[PDB]
Design an enzyme around this catalytic site. Structure first.
Site, short mmCIF file in Angstrom:
data_model
loop_
_atom_site.label_atom_id
_atom_site.label_comp_id
_atom_site.label_asym_id
_atom_site.label_seq_id
_atom_site.Cartn_x
_atom_site.Cartn_y
_atom_site.Cartn_z
N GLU A 1 0.85 -1.46 -0.01
CA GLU A 1 0.08 -0.04 0.13
C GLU A 1 0.76 1.19 -0.05
O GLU A 1 0.47 2.26 -0.59
CB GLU A 1 -1.19 0.17 1.24
CG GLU A 1 -1.94 -1.10 1.39
CD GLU A 1 -3.21 -0.98 0.21
OE1 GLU A 1 -3.90 -1.78 -0.16
OE2 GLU A 1 -3.08 0.15 -0.38
N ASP B 1 -6.17 6.34 -5.18
CA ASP B 1 -5.86 5.14 -5.29
C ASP B 1 -5.52 4.67 -6.88
O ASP B 1 -5.95 5.32 -7.71
CB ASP B 1 -6.52 4.23 -4.21
CG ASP B 1 -7.93 3.92 -4.75
OD1 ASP B 1 -8.60 2.96 -4.24
OD2 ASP B 1 -8.28 4.23 -5.95
#
Length: 164
Positions: A11, A20
Site C-alpha cells: 500500500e 488510489d
C-alpha cells in the site's frame, strides 16, 4: 514479516490525500476515504476520521493509527463473515495474512465473489487455487500485487515479499 509489514509494502505510505489505483480519494497506508469525486467530500471524511481540521494532510502517527484500526476491522470482518471465517480458520498463519490482505484491498464483499477459490484454499489445493485466483479483474488490474498475494497462498512462505 507480519500482516503490518506486508500491507505497508503493498500500500505504501502517503501523508497527503491521493487517488488510489481505482481513482478514489485515499490517505495514509491505503485508507480509503470516499468513492465520491469531490475532494471536498474527501477532506471532510478525513477530518471526521482524525478528529481535527487537517486540511488534507496528516502526520505519520495519524496514518499509523488509521492503519491499526483498518487491520483490526479487516480481521474482525473476516471472523464475522460466514463465508470467510471457515476459510480463515482452516489456514496456517502465513496464508491467513494473504486472506487478510485481499479483504483490506477489496472488502469482505469483493472477496466473497471468489467462491471457487475460497473452496480450493479450504481444501488445501494450492496450485489449483493459485491458477483460479488469477482469473479475476483483481489480478488483471493490479498484477504485481496480485502475484505477491497469490504466491503467498501457493507456497505458504514470505518469499514474494523478501525481495521487497
Amino acid at each position: 514479516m507480519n500482516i503490518f509489514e506486508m500491507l505497508r509494502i503493498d500500500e505504501g505510505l502517503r501523508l497527503k490525500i491521493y487517488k488510489d489505483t481505482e481513482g478514489y480519494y485515499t490517505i495514509g497506508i491505503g485508507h480509503l476515504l470516499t468513492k465520491s469525486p469531490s475532494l471536498n467530500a474527501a477532506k471532510s471524511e478525513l477530518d471526521k476520521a482524525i478528529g481535527r481540521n487537517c486540511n488534507g494532510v496528516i502526520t505519520k502517527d495519524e496514518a499509523e493509527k488509521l492503519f491499526n484500526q483498518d487491520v483490526d476491522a479487516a480481521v474482525r470482518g473476516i471472523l464475522r463473515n460466514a463465508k470467510l471465517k471457515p476459510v480463515y480458520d482452516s489456514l496456517d498463519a502465513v496464508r491467513r495474512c494473504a486472506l487478510i490482505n485481499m479483504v483490506f484491498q477489496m472488502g469482505e464483499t469483493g472477496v466473497a465473489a471468489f467462491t471457487n477459490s475460497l473452496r480450493m484454499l479450504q481444501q488445501k489445493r494450492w496450485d489449483e487455487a493459485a491458477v483460479n485466483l488469477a482469473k479475476s479483474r483483481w489480478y488483471n488490474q493490479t498484477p504485481n500485487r496480485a502475484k505477491r498475494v497469490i504466491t503467498t497462498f501457493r507456497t505458504g512462505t514470505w518469499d514474494a515479499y523478501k525481495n521487497l
